[PDB]
Amino acid sequence: LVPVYIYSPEYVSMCDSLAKIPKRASMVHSLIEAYALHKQMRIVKPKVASMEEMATFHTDAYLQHLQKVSQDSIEYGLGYDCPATEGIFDYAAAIGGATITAAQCLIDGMCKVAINWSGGWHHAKKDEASGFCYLNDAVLGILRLRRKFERILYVDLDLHHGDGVEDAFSFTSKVMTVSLHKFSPGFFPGTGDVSDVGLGKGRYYSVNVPIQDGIQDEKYYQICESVLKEVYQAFNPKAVVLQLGADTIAGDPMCSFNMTPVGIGKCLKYILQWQLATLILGGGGYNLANTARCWTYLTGVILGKTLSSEIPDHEFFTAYGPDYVLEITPSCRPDRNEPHRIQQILNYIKGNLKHVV
Ligand SMILES: CN(C)c1ccc(C(=O)NCCCCCCC(=O)NO)cc1
Ligand SMILES: [Co+2]
Numbered sequence: 194l195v196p197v198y199i200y201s202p203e204y205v206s207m208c209d210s211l212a213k214i215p216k217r218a219s220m221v222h223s224l225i226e227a228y229a230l231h232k233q234m235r236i237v238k239p240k241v242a243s244m245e246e247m248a249t250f251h252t253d254a255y256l257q258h259l260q261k262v263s264q265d266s267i268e269y270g271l272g273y274d275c276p277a278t279e280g281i282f283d284y285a286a287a288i289g290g291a292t293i294t295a296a297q298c299l300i301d302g303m304c305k306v307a308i309n310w311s312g313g314w315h316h317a318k319k320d321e322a323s324g325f326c327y328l329n330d331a332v333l334g335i336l337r338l339r340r341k342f343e344r345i346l347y348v349d350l351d352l353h354h355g356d357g358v359e360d361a362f363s364f365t366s367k368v369m370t371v372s373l374h375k376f377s378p379g380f381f382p383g384t385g386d387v388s389d390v391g392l393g394k395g396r397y398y399s400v401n402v403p404i405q406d407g408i409q410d411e412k413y414y415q416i417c418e419s420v421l422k423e424v425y426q427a428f429n430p431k432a433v434v435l436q437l438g439a440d441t442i443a444g445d446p447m448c449s450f451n452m453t454p455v456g457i458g459k460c461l462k463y464i465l466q467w468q469l470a471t472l473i474l475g476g477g478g479y480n481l482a483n484t485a486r487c488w489t490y491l492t493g494v495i496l497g498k499t500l501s502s503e504i505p506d507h508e509f510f511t512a513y514g515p516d517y518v519l520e521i522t523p524s525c526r527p528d529r530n531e532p533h534r535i536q537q538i539l540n541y542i543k544g545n546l547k548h549v550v
């Protein structure tokens with residue numbers, strides 16, 4: 194009954210070493226902990242991913258290059274996007290096996306909810322590092338759930354289209370990928386439009402909710418709930434893998450959406466309320482301070498608690514200036530989202546979302 198928390202001082206400090214999000218893992222942990230939230234969670238040391246466990250989704254031709262590069266890489270996407278910095282491999286198996294580990298504690302009755310905030314890398318392709326993802330811990334996790342479950346539902350709430358995971362299963366009807374993400378021309382990865390729904394026996398079992406800048410907790414919880422509404426029926430999932438990137442939270446430098454940990458919390462509540470096994474992953478999130486606030490607050494809903502509004506003093510207490518409160522206030526900017534356009538989509542989806550069984 195006690196949610197699993199994938200921790201380990203080794204792990205956390207292993208993640209801290211990721212260039213793009215320095216010490217993010219720590220700030221997240223320390224804050225979640227300085228809230229005594231781990232006192233109500235089944236902490237579990239995460240295992241390192243085996244070369245054969247990663248070989249479950251990634252080609253060996255690729256897994257190979259990753260290993261012999263963490264001492265013509267430009268062929269695996271190892272450039273400015275995903276630099277081949279020494280050790281990124283030892284790091285990959287870390288986050289990967291860390292998600293697989295949480296997958297297990299889910300199919301072991303060990304809990305109805307496993308959490309691993311350091312995971313979420315969804316852009317990673319079968320044989321190609323993409324958008325800061327060198328391994329696709331999400332796919333690796335979904336593939337571990339496929340052992341005890343027959344229909345896994347992946348829900349990507351990160352600001353970017355969860356493509357890597359989507360393609361990983363676009364040809365299957367056993368895993369349905371839903372993704373709410375800003376869609377616009379020139380904005381990464383650029384894929385994932387409402388039209389996009391997969392192929393093969395997996396046609397339609399791929400959902401996409403292209404949103405514009407500004408969307409706040411209101412219009413968001415509606416779109417998310419309604420879209421999940423249809424999906425909980427048409428698909429009737431067994432397990433759930435939810436990606437919760439916090440780069441959709443007013444504050445992030447990505448400066449696109451304009452949510453707060455609350456809107457995303459409603460969605461989380463609505464999904465938790467199906468009581469199916471749920472694997473929680475984090476992902477993007479560029480306002481280190483804010484990111485920790487958002488996930489801690491989310492850890493707080495998963496635990497059903499109501500966290501203190503004032504930010505407890507902890508190692509990084511300094512970085513929550515200049516208000517030192519757990520809440521985020523929406524930016525004072527517009528909502529380029531047409532109420533009418535949202536409708537066309539919500540329907541086009543409702544439409545496609547039916548030919549399912
Ligand atoms: C200010 N600065 C130095 C930069 C700003 C933006 C990017 C970028 O978006 N690059 C393209 C790849 C973006 C990947 C985002 C990964 C993500 O959040 N996935 O969910 C790079 C550098
Ligand atoms: Co993102």
Ligand SMILES: [K+]
Nearest residue numbers: 349351373374
């Ligand atoms: K997304």
Ligand SMILES: [K+]
Nearest residue numbers: 362365368398
């Ligand atoms: K699919």
